[PDB]
Amino acid sequence: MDVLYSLSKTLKDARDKIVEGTLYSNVSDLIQQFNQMIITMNGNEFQTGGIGNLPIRNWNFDFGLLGTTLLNLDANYVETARNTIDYFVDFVDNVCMDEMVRESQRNGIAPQSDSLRKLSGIKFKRINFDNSSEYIENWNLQNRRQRTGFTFHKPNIFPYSASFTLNRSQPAHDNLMGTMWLNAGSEIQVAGFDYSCAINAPANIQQFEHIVQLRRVLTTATITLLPDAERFSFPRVINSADGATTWYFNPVILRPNNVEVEFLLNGQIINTYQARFGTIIARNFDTIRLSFQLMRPPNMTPAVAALFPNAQPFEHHATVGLTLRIESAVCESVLADASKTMLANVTSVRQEYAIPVGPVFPPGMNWTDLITNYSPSREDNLQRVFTVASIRSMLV
Amino acid sequence: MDVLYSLSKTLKDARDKIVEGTLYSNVSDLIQQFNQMIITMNGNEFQTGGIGNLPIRNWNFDFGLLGTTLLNLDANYVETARNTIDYFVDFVDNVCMDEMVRESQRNGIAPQSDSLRKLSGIKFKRINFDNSSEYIENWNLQNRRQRTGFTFHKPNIFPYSASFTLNRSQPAHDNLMGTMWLNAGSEIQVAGFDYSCAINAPANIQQFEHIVQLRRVLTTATITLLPDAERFSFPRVINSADGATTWYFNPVILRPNNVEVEFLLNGQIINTYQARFGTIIARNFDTIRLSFQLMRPPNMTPAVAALFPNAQPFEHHATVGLTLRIESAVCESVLADASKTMLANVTSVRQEYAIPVGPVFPPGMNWTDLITNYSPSREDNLQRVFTVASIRSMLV
Amino acid sequence: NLPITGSMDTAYANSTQEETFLTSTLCLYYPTEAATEINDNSWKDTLSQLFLTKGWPTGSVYFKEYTDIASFSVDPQLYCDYNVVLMKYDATLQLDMSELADLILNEWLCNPMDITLYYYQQTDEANKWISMGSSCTIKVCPLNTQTLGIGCLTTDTATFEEVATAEKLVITDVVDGVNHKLDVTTATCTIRNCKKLGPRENVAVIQVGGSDVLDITADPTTAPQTERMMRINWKKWWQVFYTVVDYVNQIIQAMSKRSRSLNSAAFYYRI
Amino acid sequence: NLPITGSMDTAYANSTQEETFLTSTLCLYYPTEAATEINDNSWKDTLSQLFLTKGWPTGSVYFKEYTDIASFSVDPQLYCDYNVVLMKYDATLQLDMSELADLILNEWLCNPMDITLYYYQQTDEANKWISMGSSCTIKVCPLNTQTLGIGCLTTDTATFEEVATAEKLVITDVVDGVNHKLDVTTATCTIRNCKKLGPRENVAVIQVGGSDVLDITADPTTAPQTERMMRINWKKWWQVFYTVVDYVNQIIQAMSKRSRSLNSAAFYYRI
Numbered sequence A, B: 001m002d003v004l005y006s007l008s009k010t011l012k013d014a015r016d017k018i019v020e021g022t023l024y025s026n027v028s029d030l031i032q033q034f035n036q037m038i039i040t041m042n043g044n045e046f047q048t049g050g051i052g053n054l055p056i057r058n059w060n061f062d063f064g065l066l067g068t069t070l071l072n073l074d075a076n077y078v079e080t081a082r083n084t085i086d087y088f089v090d091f092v093d094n095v096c097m098d099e100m101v102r103e104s105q106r107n108g109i110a111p112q113s114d115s116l117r118k119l120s121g122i123k124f125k126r127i128n129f130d131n132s133s134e135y136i137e138n139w140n141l142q143n144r145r146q147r148t149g150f151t152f153h154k155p156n157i158f159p160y161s162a163s164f165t166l167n168r169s170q171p172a173h174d175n176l177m178g179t180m181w182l183n184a185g186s187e188i189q190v191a192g193f194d195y196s197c198a199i200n201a202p203a204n205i206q207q208f209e210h211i212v213q214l215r216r217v218l219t220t221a222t223i224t225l226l227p228d229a230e231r232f233s234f235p236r237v238i239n240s241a242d243g244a245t246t247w248y249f250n251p252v253i254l255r256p257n258n259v260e261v262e263f264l265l266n267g268q269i270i271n272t273y274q275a276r277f278g279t280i281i282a283r284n285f286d287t288i289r290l291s292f293q294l295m296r297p298p299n300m301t302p303a304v305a306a307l308f309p310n311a312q313p314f315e316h317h318a319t320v321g322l323t324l325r326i327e328s329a330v331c332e333s334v335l336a337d338a339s340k341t342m343l344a345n346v347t348s349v350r351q352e353y354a355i356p357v358g359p360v361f362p363p364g365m366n367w368t369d370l371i372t373n374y375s376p377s378r379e380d381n382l383q384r385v386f387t388v389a390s391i392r393s394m395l396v
Numbered sequence C, D: 001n002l003p004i005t006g007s008m009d010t011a012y013a014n015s016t017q018e019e020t021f022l023t024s025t026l027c028l029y030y031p032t033e034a035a036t037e038i039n040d041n042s043w044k045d046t047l048s049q050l051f052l053t054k055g056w057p058t059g060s061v062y063f064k065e066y067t068d069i070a071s072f073s074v075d076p077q078l079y080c081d082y083n084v085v086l087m088k089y090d091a092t093l094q095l096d097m098s099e100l101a102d103l104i105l106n107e108w109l110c111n112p113m114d115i116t117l118y119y120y121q122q123t124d125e126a127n128k129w130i131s132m133g134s135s136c137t138i139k140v141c142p143l144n145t146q147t148l149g150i151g152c153l154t155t156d157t158a159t160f161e162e163v164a165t166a167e168k169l170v171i172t173d174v175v176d177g178v179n180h181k182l183d184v185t186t187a188t189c190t191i192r193n194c195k196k197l198g199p200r201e202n203v204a205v206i207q208v209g210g211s212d213v214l215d216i217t218a219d220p221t222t223a224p225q226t227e228r229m230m231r232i233n234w235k236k237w238w239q240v241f242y243t244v245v246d247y248v249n250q251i252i253q254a255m256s257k258r259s260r261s262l263n264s265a266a267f268y269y270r271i
């Protein structure tokens, strides 16, 4: 991986810096590294592909070195460099694609393609140079068994789930108490509803709770909390739990009461915010506990008093919502997020070449299944393929 | 692991071979290896950690070389060697214990304790010599991504499960048809029971099927198959599936008819055995399908015909059994088995020092839970700890 | 009762209308004047066959007759899994019909009221006094802390406050938190202290003619018309029964299974 | 009917007897002579109170009276969730007792028979002909493969073979696979072609006095005597009822819920 990344970085620097008219002083070290790469790769045969519809390709390296006596680069030097750069870039892209489409259960972190396994030999470490990208940096930290870290803007940590729970229910579904939620990506919209508006509640208060378990620990997370769940603030007909029938939800929104968002790590309360909305910080957590209350308004105007009668029928159903959005976070494991494209790259490469479903990832690289059962083996394979995808993105 | 194994092997060889009066020609290579170990270890400081109640221990190595120039080993030589060997054996045992009690979700195949991580450095590679044990051989094969093989006598492959399935049932539980089984270790006992004795069956034949999906592929397996299942051939009072009530079982054993044992790999029939009892060979399989039949005897003596009336009540219930014992097998993964002691050693070491439950293994190293969810991370950690346990057992 | 967790992505199941029609019974309650006007001894069989055309198995639809609203209100016994009451409208009985609805469109937990030995009070808005019989004349005398009476003398029933006279059914609501001496004709009336638990889903009331006058809630601020309170204009009873038969699926859709666990003694007509 | 998979370690639930009594009902069937000897106008009330001491809520236990075994045999309707039939033993009515026990202790699937038009045969051992009514007289004429009577004349009903005379209930079991012409007093009794599905687990029969003579299976080689067929000795009916009440726990233990789905809507009690 380090050798493949170094090949890609050398090629990218060659593309960027070997330009017409530039002082040789601007590329001397780069030209030395490039010639070292040529020397190391010369006489080596590689084979990529042979999986799915990815074609089998044979790579031979017999290249001359670049000149070193120029003061300023000219057209001839640039074209001579560019021929070799094109061949090497094609080789690196094919190696990256071959590695992105393979997976193993026991040793998924290790290289899978024969080309990368061959490149993992000692003699190729001469190619190795600056490893500055975030993903290669984390790869090297992981290989050294140091603490790793990935910054995610809107991390896709919550698998898609639009569900509900009815703590009070009847077959006719006319006096319902419960809570409905959507967890999607970095978003958690929850809404606790009481059809009776907590008229019979002990203190005219109904307590609603929502616990969301994150499959990985998030640190240095910035979250925005808002007091309404727009997703569950309009009337809708919702299937029954068994699917036998459907019920009617007719929300009327009241502000949530005694809002308390707790961020927990291993069952211990790390962060706690009561009646706090806007931007909050969760420094380290793996579980979120949103506990809110529906409080019956003790004083009501005639219209509000008309909304909520003493007994059934209950035509307007009191609802209190919370919205939680993780805008940024840091995770020791790789995750899909809104800003990056590694998941998209891996899925695109797997789809374009009709890679058969492997024993590790879910079919079609579907993210909800992947994050629902994010096992250590899946984490290893995902880190490998994401690092390969970033390396490929340097060039392609 | 190879360095730790080589330390243990050198110490075991020294203890076995460095004996009073023995020719030096019997130990020359052993003495050379022992002196190499002393030179490599001299001047190095080691620490076995304080995980759980395991004491923190510090090890310093400053030992003179074992002497040459003796035709036959005398008592002074053996005494000096015994002092050095005792200290080294204590160090190796403590390192093995420290490694046996640690685990990681990811990279669980790598060393966990600081002592073994230090031993994994290049400078200690000199200590490495003959790796002949089955576990170290398979460890080296796994390191190189080669085919691995562990031979087990009575492999612990089936998690404990005493369950039943009622294909025909009703609240009174007086006319039941179904199967009850115990899958434990290398043994499967199954029994298909019909209370009506197939009086109303299409051809007076009731078909029973039992599918056991092994969580690891077994190869070169010798299996004893016996007609009757003694575990389900006596009267029982069995709880209902939901535990609401208890039903009565009153077996009368008829011989199983049209017995069909299929050993399947990836849903493909690898081995088939029809009406065969005694020793059979399943060369490569991961699923077992036992299809047997209860055939109503066309001719019944007056005593027999009294047990099987035309209609209810059915006081005697016709049962056909099957026993299947895996006497020995080969698996690419590490498993508990009757003969070896790796699981017992690891569990004993963890229990003795009150090691807190980690994130990899079930509490108490429970084998049923371990093998029910035998995940790749669990396989890596289990192979690591079992190899360390086998290394320790060479000396302790 | 346990929490029920459901996914909003679950697929809708097929129509269960045919299965519930096959495995449930329908009771139709009509006034005797309906049978009089129809003037046919086989109309039960004809309606059963028409319901069979609608899907109900033969014999699942039970036809029950009552003389009038007043007589029907004396301890009505609803048997089938689904009950439909064709209630004739009378401008003079607006309360009575309402009371009848309030008794059959809601679940009631009732206990005896031996007024000769005890003075009773209504603890909350759900508590009412349901009196049923041939003739229910209920007089009320609110009492004070010394249990003597306000604007009434406990001994003199004449001075009592009249809340019902010559009634087959009456639901009495007095001011809560006050003890009352009750004088009822126990010979021809039984009074019960009752709490309304909630709607009774398996009973629908179709008002034949008139306007919306039903008020199944004692609260003056609410007069809610649930889906189980239908109202049809009419001139012939055959048309009424034909529209009941044709829209039977709609009527049952507005109704649900009773879902209540009872402790009382009533027969049922079930399949 | 899906397979049920269970583990042999599932923890037992607590006793459901209390909730079962609170949510089920018991119908006790006794002869008229029982009430005649008891000679009390409220023995039902005291029996219900004793049952309440035993657990059953008031109004849950129902008491049904029948004149005698013969009269009770004419289309017996069993209402409650649990039914206990106290059948007195008469040494001269053993077959009638057996027929009643066979009818009410087993589940039957019956269809009508037109003895006037078509010939009939019994397919298998589970197939019988149950005829009940005010008076059942059944004569049978077995036919040969040319639909000609054997030892009987199709045209002449006098040559028929008599299998029932003036019976109120009779189960006819003829040779299977042979077509028979049936002469039945259809004007006073109905014959139905029935198949025995299985046992009725909610009906227990307590034989008062006598010996074990019941035979609910036509097979000569079986006299089952299931756990739902009890027998007691008696001199007074009050002792019999006290024994029934005291050991109602065991009696219900011997019975299970019906568990059969019926396509016919009948009258039942269900709490």
Ligand SMILES: *[C@@H]1O[C@H](CO)[C@@H](O)[C@H](O)[C@H]1NC(C)=O
Binding pocket: C014
């Ligand atoms: C539901 O309806 C569909 C469409 O007619 C049919 O294919 C299916 O078998 C029905 N039953 C179920 C259980 O889905």
Ligand SMILES: *[C@@H]1O[C@H](CO)[C@@H](O)[C@H](O)[C@H]1NC(C)=O
Binding pocket: D014
């Ligand atoms: C069941 O019985 C046990 C022991 O008598 C008692 O503690 C428990 O509350 C009962 N109920 C349940 C639901 O376990």
Ligand SMILES: [Ca+2]
Binding pocket: C095, C096, C099, C167, C168, C169, C170
């Ligand atoms: Ca009235």
Ligand SMILES: [Ca+2]
Binding pocket: C151, C152, C159, C160, C161
């Ligand atoms: Ca007055």
Ligand SMILES: [Ca+2]
Binding pocket: C122, C124, C125, C127, C173, C174, C175, C176
């Ligand atoms: Ca009141």
Ligand SMILES: [Ca+2]
Binding pocket: C215, C216, C217, C218, C219, C220, C221, C222, C223
């Ligand atoms: Ca009102």
Ligand SMILES: [Ca+2]
Binding pocket: D095, D096, D099, D167, D168, D169, D170
């Ligand atoms: Ca008879």
Ligand SMILES: [Ca+2]
Binding pocket: D151, D152, D153, D158, D159, D160, D161
């Ligand atoms: Ca004759």
Ligand SMILES: [Ca+2]
Binding pocket: D122, D124, D125, D127, D173, D174, D175, D176
């Ligand atoms: Ca027969």
Ligand SMILES: [Ca+2]
Binding pocket: D215, D216, D217, D218, D219, D220, D221, D222, D223
């Ligand atoms: Ca018999």
Ligand SMILES: [Cl-]
Binding pocket: A154, A338
């Ligand atoms: Cl954004």
Ligand SMILES: [Cl-]
Binding pocket: B154, B338
């Ligand atoms: Cl053995």
Ligand SMILES: [Zn+2]
Binding pocket: A166, A169, A173, A239, A240, A241, A247, C004
């Ligand atoms: Zn629901």
Ligand SMILES: [Zn+2]
Binding pocket: B153, B154, B338
């Ligand atoms: Zn052995």
Ligand SMILES: [Zn+2]
Binding pocket: B166, B169, B173, B239, B240, B241, B247, D004
């Ligand atoms: Zn069961």
